[PDB]
C-alpha cells in the first residue's frame, strides 16, 4: 500500500507474450503463445490431461502436444482457448491476481471493432479488473528511445506497421498493415527444405525452426554479388549440429527465406518492398514534412536484429529518393523490447489516468464505454 | 570550486584522526575506509573521449585514456573487458528463467554519462 | 559354485564398463587437446580482428574530418 | 512411483472443486491461495495445506525380501520385534502402511459405535 | 572354495579403474562445456568483427573518393 | 533441532531412573532396553555414499563408510554381507514352494534411501 499501487505491463503477440512485476523495465515473465491437446491421450489417468500444455511447461515437451495457433497475426481462429492462456500469465508466471492489480495491454492499430469488447468484456465482465487499457504498439517506443520527430517501422513478429508518428497521432493515415513477418518465414523455410531431403512438417517441428533461425540465418549483402561467392565454402555454409541428431551445413538456405521480406513475389502479392510502401506512405503527407524524416528512421522489433538490416536500407532508398538531408537509421541496444521499455512508461505515469478505463466508467456508459472514452 | 576560505581541512585532518579513534577507527579501519573513496575517485577520473566511430549523429563509447580506465577496473578487482562490454553496452533478457546478457549496441554519449 | 558365478559375472561389468569407459575418456581426453588448440587459434584471430577493425575506427575518423 | 505429490495435488483440484467443502487459487479467484498451496474447509474454519512429502511420508512400505532377512535371526532382541506374524491384526498383509492408517482409525469408530 | 577367493582379487581392480577414469571423464565433460561456450562466443565476435570492417572499408572507399 | 528451552534432559534422566524402577525396570532391564535404541541409533549412522559406479542417469549404492554400516550388523548380530546384498538389492521369486532369492540388480537412490 503506502507509496505501491503495482501495475502489471503486458505486451502479448504472435511470438511471445511479455510481461513483467511492477515498474520494471525489460519483461520478466514470458512464454510462447500455443494451447493444444493430447493427440497422445494424456495416458488420461498418468492425468485427466486437460491443461493443453501451456508456458515454459509446453514449449518444453512439445512432440507428444498437438499444438493448436489461436492468434495468426491478427485473427483470432478461436477466443475460447484465449482464456486458458490468460490463465497461465498472472496467476503461473506473475503470481498475482487481476482482481487486485491494474493491466496495460498492447493494441494493433485498424483491429476489428468486435474484438474491443470481446476483450474487455472478459476482464471486466468476469474476471474484475478495477482497472485496464490498449495502448498502441509503436507509439510506446517513441518515448522510451528518446525521440520526438521520426517514421517508426515497428515489426516484432506479428504485422508490419509502417507508422510515421513524429508529432501526434490519428491524422490522415500514412500507415499500412502487412501480413508479412516472423511466423511468415518460418512456414517457409521448410517449403524451400524439401529440395535438400528436409521437411519440417507440423507445428512441433515448425517451432525448432525458429530456434535454428536466431542462430545462424542471415541477409545477404546483396544476393547478386554473393550469387558468385557462392564457390567459396567459407562464408556461406555453416555446420549446425541438431541437438535431436542431424547434421545440416546450411548455406543458401539462411538468406533465400528472409529474401521474401523484400521480395512479396515470393508469397503471391502484388505488394513492393518494404521501402516503396514507405514512399507511398510518405507521399501521402505533407512536403515540409518530409526532410527530417529522413534525417532519423526508426526501426524496431525483432526483424531488425538480424545480421544485415540496417546497412541494406541505406543503398536502395538513398539511390531513389531525396538526395539532400543526412541518411541515418537509429537501431537501439535492444530494438526488439524497445516496445516493452515504452511500455512499462506509461504504467508507471500518473498522467495516465485520464485516459484508462475504471470500473465504474464501464457500467455508465455501458459496452461502448471503449469506443466512447478511447479511439 | 575546491579551496574554501573559513574550513582549513589540511590542519583538521588530524584533529579529526584523535576522533576518529575516539569512537574506534583505528589506522587499519582508516585505510580500509580511504579504499572506498578511493574507488569513487578511480569513477572520477574515468569520463569517455566521445568516440569517433560514427561519421555523424549518434555516437559510441571509447576510452582512449587506458590508464586512468584501468586504474578504477585494478582496484575494484575486476576484469577491465567485461566492465567495459557490460556497461558501455547495456544487457537485457531476464526471462525469469533468469537472463542471458551480452546482446546490446552502442548509444549516444549524453545517456552514457548519464548512466555514468 | 553360485557365489563364484555371481561374483565372476561382476567382473565381466566391471570389466565391460572399465574398457568402455576408459576408451572414451581417452579419446575424449585427446579431442579436448584438439578443441583447446582450436579455442586459442579462433581467440587469436579475433585478437587480429579486433584490433583491425579499431584501426579503421581511427581510420575512418581522421578521413571524415580531412573530408569535411 | 511417477506421480509425485504436485501431480496427486493436480487431481483433486479437477476430481473436486465442485463437491462442497474446498478451494484453491485457480476456482476461487482470491490471491490469499498460493499457487504452491491450496485451501480446504473444514467444518467451519479455513486451512491451507502443502503438499511436502505427501506420498513418501504416508507410504511406509516395507516387503518381505527386507523383513525377512530380520526375521530370520537367532538374536531373541532382534527377532522381538518381529513377532510370530500378525498379533490380533491379520486379515492382508501387503497394502503399504498409509492406507493401514486408514484400517487403524475405522476399527476404533467401528468398536466406538457398539457400546454405551 | 580358493577360487572364490581369487576371483575377488581381480574385481576391485576394474571398479577402481572405471571409477577413477569416470572421475577425469565428468571433468573433461565439464571442461568442454565451458571451452565450447566461449568459442561460438568468440566465433560471434570474430563475425561480427569481420561485419565491421566489410563496412568501414566500403564507407572508407566513398570517403576517399568525396575527398579527391 | 536437538535442544529444547523447556525441558531439561540432562537432570530429568536421574529422575525418571526412579519411575523405572518404581514399575520395575531394574538397571538389568534398562540396560537391555538401550540396545534396541543403540540399533535404532547404528541405524541412523548408516547413509548412502551415492555410489558413482554408473556414469550418468541411474546409480548404485555402495557404502564407503564401512565402519558405521559394520557397526550395525555387528550389533544385528547377522552378516554384514548379506546385510547390503540382500537389502541393496531385493529378492523376488515366492513360487508357492516358498521363494528362491538374490536375484537383481541395482535402483536409484531415492528409492534407496526410501526403502531405507
Ligand atoms: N537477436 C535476434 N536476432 C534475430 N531474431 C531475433 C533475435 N532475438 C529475437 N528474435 C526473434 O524475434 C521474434 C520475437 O520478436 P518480438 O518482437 O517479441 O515478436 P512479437 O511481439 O510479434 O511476439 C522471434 O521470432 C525471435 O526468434
Ligand atoms: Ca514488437
Same mark, same amino acid.
Given at each position: 500500500?503506502?507509496?505501491?499501487?503495482?501495475?502489471?505491463?503486458?505486451?502479448?503477440?504472435?511470438?511471445?507474450?511479455?510481461? /513483467?512485476?511492477?515498474?520494471?523495465?525489460?519483461?520478466?515473465?514470458?512464454?510462447?503463445?500455443?494451447?493444444?491437446?493430447?493427440?497422445?491421450?494424456?495416458?488420461?489417468?498418468?492425468?485427466?490431461?486437460?491443461?493443453?500444455?501451456?508456458?515454459?511447461?509446453?514449449?518444453?515437451?512439445?512432440?507428444?502436444?498437438?499444438?493448436?495457433?489461436?492468434?495468426?497475426?491478427?485473427?483470432?481462429?478461436?477466443?475460447?482457448?484465449?482464456?486458458?492462456?490468460?490463465?497461465?500469465?498472472?496467476?503461473?508466471?506473475?503470481?498475482?491476481?487481476?482482481?487486485?492489480?491494474?493491466?496495460?495491454?498492447?493494441?494493433?492499430?485498424?483491429?476489428?471493432?468486435?474484438?474491443?469488447?470481446?476483450?474487455?468484456?472478459?476482464?471486466?465482465?468476469?474476471?474484475?479488473?478495477?482497472?485496464?487499457?490498449?495502448?498502441?504498439?509503436?507509439?510506446?517506443?517513441?518515448?522510451?528511445?528518446?525521440?520526438?520527430?521520426?517514421?517508426?517501422?515497428?515489426?516484432?513478429? /506479428?504485422?508490419?506497421?509502417?507508422?510515421?508518428?513524429?508529432?501526434?497521432?490519428?491524422?490522415?493515415?500514412?500507415?499500412?498493415?502487412?501480413?508479412?513477418? /516472423?511466423?511468415?518465414?518460418?512456414?517457409?523455410?521448410?517449403?524451400?527444405?524439401?529440395?535438400?531431403?528436409?521437411?519440417?512438417?507440423?507445428?512441433?517441428?515448425?517451432?525448432?525452426?525458429?530456434?535454428?533461425?536466431?542462430?545462424?540465418?542471415?541477409?545477404?549483402?546483396?544476393?547478386?554479388?554473393?550469387?558468385?561467392?557462392?564457390?567459396?565454402?567459407?562464408?556461406?555454409?555453416?555446420?549446425?549440429?541438431?541437438?535431436? /541428431?542431424?547434421?545440416?551445413?546450411?548455406?543458401?538456405?539462411?538468406?533465400?527465406?528472409?529474401?521474401?521480406?523484400?521480395?512479396?513475389?515470393?508469397?503471391?502479392?502484388?505488394?513492393?518492398?518494404?521501402?516503396?510502401?514507405?514512399?507511398?506512405?510518405?507521399?501521402?503527407?505533407?512536403?515540409?514534412?518530409?526532410?527530417?524524416?529522413?534525417?532519423?528512421?526508426?526501426?524496431?522489433?525483432?526483424?531488425?536484429?538480424?545480421?544485415?538490416?540496417?546497412?541494406?536500407?541505406?543503398?536502395?532508398?538513398?539511390?531513389?529518393?531525396?538526395?539532400?538531408?543526412?541518411?541515418?537509421?537509429?537501431?537501439?541496444?535492444?530494438?526488439?523490447?524497445?516496445?516493452?521499455?515504452?511500455?512499462?512508461?506509461?504504467?508507471?505515469?500518473?498522467?495516465?489516468?485520464?485516459?484508462?478505463?475504471?470500473?465504474?466508467?464501464?457500467?455508465?456508459?455501458?459496452?461502448?464505454?471503449?469506443?466512447?472514452?478511447?479511439? | 570550486?575546491?579551496?574554501?576560505?573559513?574550513?582549513?581541512?589540511?590542519?583538521?585532518?588530524?584533529?579529526?584522526?584523535?576522533?576518529?579513534?575516539?569512537?574506534?577507527?583505528?589506522?587499519?579501519?582508516?585505510?580500509?575506509?580511504?579504499?572506498?573513496?578511493?574507488?569513487?575517485?578511480?569513477?572520477?577520473?574515468?569520463?569517455?573521449?566521445?568516440?569517433?566511430?560514427?561519421?555523424?549523429?549518434?555516437?559510441?563509447?571509447?576510452?582512449?585514456?587506458?590508464?586512468?580506465?584501468?586504474?578504477?577496473?585494478?582496484?575494484?578487482?575486476?576484469?577491465?573487458?567485461?566492465?567495459?562490454?557490460?556497461?558501455?553496452?547495456?544487457?537485457?533478457?531476464?526471462?525469469?528463467?533468469?537472463?542471458?546478457?551480452?546482446?546490446?549496441?552502442?548509444?549516444?554519449?549524453?545517456?552514457?554519462?548519464?548512466?555514468? | 559354485?553360485?557365489?563364484?558365478?555371481?561374483?565372476?559375472?561382476?567382473?565381466?561389468?566391471?570389466?565391460?564398463?572399465?574398457?568402455?569407459?576408459?576408451?572414451?575418456?581417452?579419446?575424449?581426453?585427446?579431442?579436448?587437446?584438439?578443441?583447446?588448440?582450436?579455442?586459442?587459434?579462433?581467440?587469436?584471430?579475433?585478437?587480429?580482428?579486433?584490433?583491425?577493425?579499431?584501426?579503421?575506427?581511427?581510420?575512418?575518423?581522421?578521413?571524415?574530418?580531412?573530408?569535411? | 512411483?511417477?506421480?509425485?505429490?504436485?501431480?496427486?495435488?493436480?487431481?483433486?483440484?479437477?476430481?473436486?472443486?465442485?463437491?462442497?467443502?474446498?478451494?484453491?487459487?485457480?476456482?476461487?479467484?482470491?490471491?490469499?491461495?498460493?499457487?504452491?498451496?491450496?485451501?480446504?474447509?473444514?467444518?467451519?474454519?479455513?486451512?491451507?495445506?502443502?503438499?511436502?512429502?505427501?506420498?513418501?511420508?504416508?507410504?511406509?512400505?516395507?516387503?518381505?525380501?527386507?523383513?525377512?532377512?530380520?526375521?530370520?535371526?537367532?538374536?531373541?532382541?532382534?527377532?522381538?520385534?518381529?513377532?510370530?506374524?500378525?498379533?490380533?491384526?491379520?486379515?492382508?498383509?501387503?497394502?503399504?502402511?498409509?492406507?493401514?492408517?486408514?484400517?487403524?482409525?475405522?476399527?476404533?469408530?467401528?468398536?466406538?459405535?457398539?457400546?454405551?
Amino acid at each position: 500500500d503506502e507509496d505501491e499501487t503495482t501495475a502489471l505491463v503486458c505486451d502479448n503477440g504472435s511470438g511471445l507474450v511479455k510481461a /513483467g512485476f511492477a515498474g520494471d523495465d525489460a519483461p520478466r515473465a514470458v512464454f510462447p503463445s500455443i494451447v493444444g491437446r493430447p493427440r497422445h491421450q494424456g495416458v488420461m489417468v498418468g492425468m485427466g490431461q486437460k491443461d493443453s500444455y501451456v508456458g515454459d511447461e509446453a514449449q518444453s515437451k512439445r512432440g507428444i502436444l498437438t499444438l493448436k495457433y489461436p492468434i495468426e497475426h491478427g485473427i483470432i481462429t478461436n477466443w475460447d482457448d484465449m482464456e486458458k492462456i490468460w490463465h497461465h500469465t498472472f496467476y503461473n508466471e506473475l503470481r498475482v491476481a487481476p482482481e487486485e492489480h491494474p493491466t496495460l495491454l498492447t493494441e494493433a492499430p485498424l483491429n476489428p471493432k468486435a474484438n474491443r469488447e470481446k476483450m474487455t468484456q472478459i476482464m471486466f465482465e468476469t474476471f474484475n479488473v478495477p482497472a485496464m487499457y490498449v495502448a498502441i504498439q509503436a507509439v510506446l517506443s517513441l518515448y522510451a528511445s528518446g525521440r520526438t520527430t521520426g517514421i517508426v517501422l515497428d515489426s516484432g513478429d /506479428g504485422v508490419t506497421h509502417n507508422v510515421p508518428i513524429y508529432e501526434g497521432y490519428a491524422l490522415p493515415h500514412a500507415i499500412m498493415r502487412l501480413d508479412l513477418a /516472423g511466423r511468415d518465414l518460418t512456414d517457409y523455410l521448410m517449403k524451400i527444405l524439401t529440395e535438400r531431403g528436409y521437411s519440417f512438417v507440423t507445428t512441433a517441428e515448425r517451432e525448432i525452426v525458429r530456434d535454428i533461425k536466431e542462430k545462424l540465418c542471415y541477409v545477404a549483402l546483396d544476393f547478386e554479388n554473393e550469387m558468385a561467392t557462392a564457390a567459396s565454402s567459407s562464408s556461406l555454409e555453416k555446420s549446425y549440429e541438431l541437438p535431436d /541428431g542431424q547434421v545440416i551445413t546450411i548455406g543458401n538456405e539462411r538468406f533465400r527465406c528472409p529474401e521474401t521480406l523484400f521480395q512479396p513475389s515470393f508469397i503471391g502479392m502484388e505488394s513492393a518492398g518494404i521501402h516503396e510502401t514507405t514512399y507511398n506512405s510518405i507521399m501521402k503527407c505533407d512536403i515540409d514534412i518530409r526532410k527530417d524524416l529522413y534525417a532519423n528512421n526508426v526501426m524496431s522489433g525483432g526483424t531488425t536484429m538480424y545480421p544485415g538490416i540496417a546497412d541494406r536500407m541505406q543503398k536502395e532508398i538513398t539511390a531513389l529518393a531525396p538526395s539532400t538531408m543526412k541518411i541515418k537509421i537509429i537501431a537501439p541496444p535492444e530494438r526488439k523490447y524497445s516496445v516493452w521499455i515504452g511500455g512499462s512508461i506509461l504504467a508507471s505515469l500518473s498522467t495516465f489516468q485520464q485516459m484508462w478505463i475504471t470500473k465504474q466508467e464501464y457500467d455508465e456508459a455501458g459496452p461502448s464505454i471503449v469506443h466512447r472514452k478511447c479511439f | 570550486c575546491f579551496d574554501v576560505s573559513t574550513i582549513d581541512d589540511s590542519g583538521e585532518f588530524k584533529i579529526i584522526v584523535k576522533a576518529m579513534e575516539t569512537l574506534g577507527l583505528k589506522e587499519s579501519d582508516q585505510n580500509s575506509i580511504w579504499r572506498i573513496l578511493a574507488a569513487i575517485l578511480h569513477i572520477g577520473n574515468i569520463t569517455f573521449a566521445e568516440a569517433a566511430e560514427q561519421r555523424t549523429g549518434t555516437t559510441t563509447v571509447k576510452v582512449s585514456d587506458t590508464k586512468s580506465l584501468a586504474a578504477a577496473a585494478s582496484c575494484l578487482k575486476t576484469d577491465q573487458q567485461s566492465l567495459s562490454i557490460a556497461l558501455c553496452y547495456r544487457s537485457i533478457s531476464t526471462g525469469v528463467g533468469k537472463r542471458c546478457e551480452v546482446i546490446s549496441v552502442p548509444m549516444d554519449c549524453n545517456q552514457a554519462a548519464y548512466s555514468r | 559354485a553360485r557365489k563364484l558365478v555371481i561374483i565372476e559375472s561382476d567382473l565381466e561389468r566391471a570389466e565391460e564398463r572399465a574398457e568402455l569407459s576408459e576408451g572414451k575418456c581417452a579419446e575424449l581426453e585427446e579431442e579436448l587437446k584438439t578443441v583447446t588448440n582450436n579455442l586459442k587459434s579462433l581467440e587469436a584471430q579475433a585478437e587480429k580482428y579486433s584490433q583491425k577493425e579499431d584501426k579503421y575506427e581511427e581510420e575512418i575518423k581522421v578521413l571524415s574530418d580531412k573530408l569535411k | 512411483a511417477k506421480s509425485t505429490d504436485q501431480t496427486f495435488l493436480d487431481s483433486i483440484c479437477k476430481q473436486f472443486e465442485k463437491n462442497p467443502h474446498l478451494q484453491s487459487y485457480v476456482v476461487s479467484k482470491d490471491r490469499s491461495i498460493g499457487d504452491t498451496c491450496f485451501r480446504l474447509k473444514h467444518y467451519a474454519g479455513d486451512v491451507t495445506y502443502d503438499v511436502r512429502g505427501f506420498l513418501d511420508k504416508n507410504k511406509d512400505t516395507l516387503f518381505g525380501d527386507l523383513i525377512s532377512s530380520m526375521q530370520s535371526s537367532s538374536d531373541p532382541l532382534v527377532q522381538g520385534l518381529f513377532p510370530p506374524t500378525r498379533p490380533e491384526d491379520s486379515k492382508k498383509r501387503p497394502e503399504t502402511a498409509g492406507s493401514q492408517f486408514r484400517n487403524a482409525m475405522n476399527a476404533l469408530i467401528t468398536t466406538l459405535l457398539a457400546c454405551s
